[PDB]
Enzyme design. Structure first.
Site, PDB file in Angstrom:
ATOM      1  CG  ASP A  35       8.240  -9.825 -17.426  1.00 57.56           C
ATOM      2  OD1 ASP A  35       7.877  -8.716 -16.988  1.00 57.56           O
ATOM      3  OD2 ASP A  35       7.678 -10.407 -18.378  1.00 57.56           O
ATOM      4  CB  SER A 199      -0.128   6.107  -9.248  1.00 61.96           C
ATOM      5  OG  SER A 199       0.523   7.353  -9.046  1.00 61.96           O
TER       6      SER A 199
END
Length: 330
Positions: A35, A199
């Protein structure tokens, strides 16, 4: 040194991926959920409330010659999906794909919430976010990667998740045969303890790419792609019959639909998520309504590039002094 381990979907939807981890002496092999959105390595164990164990493999520290109890230490974690776990702390020898860390904190669960009990395939979590999120008290403990870093050939690990198939976690090297073209690297903020990046935008299907900054985290422990409501609305508007359902808890669509791809930006580079990756199947058994793999982050407080997005890429987690993220198509 290096390590290389295969990671395998737990079910036919790629809800999560498990990776075998060797703990203790002699080795006890448990299948953990790697994770990158958390920083605790915790396991089902001989100490876990018996009624909360249902099919998991447990770690038994008393059978490990190298296990040591961290006197007085406790841990307690809550995850974004509302699940949780807590217990005490051992150190032991931990190996992943041939890479060994001695004195790794192995957090032994005394209590786990129902979603953990109900998932017999996941024996615990191995956190790969920054160690600043580790929940051990009174003294925070280091992640497996943090402990391994100085021994690694290069201070990196890579995630290469499969679509409806196994993939790979590598430590300490970049497999140049595992991706197409080049890796584009982008800046990381560690301010919140996450592999947080920005992004450069998105496209829906064959649509023109929209340049816009989307801050979010690279999170292998989250199944879906969670993005701003504007972006998600733009995507599902291109799917006939799709709608947001408050009763189901997100966007649903006719299972017969052909889903468009979804593109996200990494600098001037582009990662394309095929439409099929966005199908998470019937909302309930036998339904002709299906659940979408791109959902709104509104109310989470953060955008999450989870498995739906990461499995479309070869992803480098660069833990150099100034960390970065790298993305390649594959």
């Amino acid at each position: 040194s290096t390590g290389s381990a295969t990671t395998t979907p737990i079910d036919s939807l790629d809800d999560a991926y498990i990776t075998p981890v060797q703990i203790g002496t002699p080795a006890q092999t448990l299948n953990l959920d790697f994770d990158t959105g958390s920083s605790d390595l915790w396991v089902f164990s001989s100490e876990t409330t018996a009624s909360e164990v249902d099919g998991q493999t447990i770690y038994t520290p008393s059978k490990s010659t190298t296990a040591k109890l961290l006197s007085g230490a406790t841990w307690s974690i809550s995850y974004g999906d509302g699940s949780s776990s807590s217990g005490d702390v051992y150190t032991d020898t931990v190996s992943v794909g041939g890479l060994t860390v001695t004195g790794q904190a192995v957090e032994s669960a005394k209590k786990v919430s129902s979603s953990f009990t109900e998932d017999s395939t996941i024996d615990g979590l191995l956190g790969l976010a920054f160690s600043t999120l580790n929940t051990v008290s009174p003294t925070q403990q280091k992640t497996f990667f943090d402990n391994a870093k100085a021994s690694l050939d290069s201070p990196v690990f890579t995630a290469d998740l499969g679509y409806h198939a196994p993939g790979t976690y590598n430590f300490g090297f970049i497999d140049t045969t595992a991706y197409t073209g080049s890796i584009t690297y982008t800046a990381v903020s560690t301010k919140q303890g996450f592999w947080e990046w920005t992004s450069t935008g998105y496209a829906v299907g064959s649509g023109t790419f929209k340049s816009t900054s989307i801050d979010g985290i690279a999170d292998t422990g989250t199944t879906l792609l969670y993005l701003p409501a504007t972006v998600v609305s733009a995507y599902w508007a291109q799917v006939s019959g799709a709608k947001s359902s408050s009763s189901v808890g997100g966007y649903v669509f006719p299972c017969s639909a052909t889903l468009p791809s979804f593109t996200f930006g990494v600098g001037s580079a582009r990662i394309v998520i095929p439409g099929d990756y966005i199908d998470f199947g019937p909302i309930s058994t036998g339904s002709s309504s299906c659940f979408g793999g791109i959902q709104s982050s509104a109310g989470i407080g953060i955008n999450i590039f989870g498995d739906v997005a990461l499995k479309a890429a070869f992803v480098v987690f660069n833990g150099a002094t100034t960390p970065t993220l790298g993305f390649a198509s594959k």
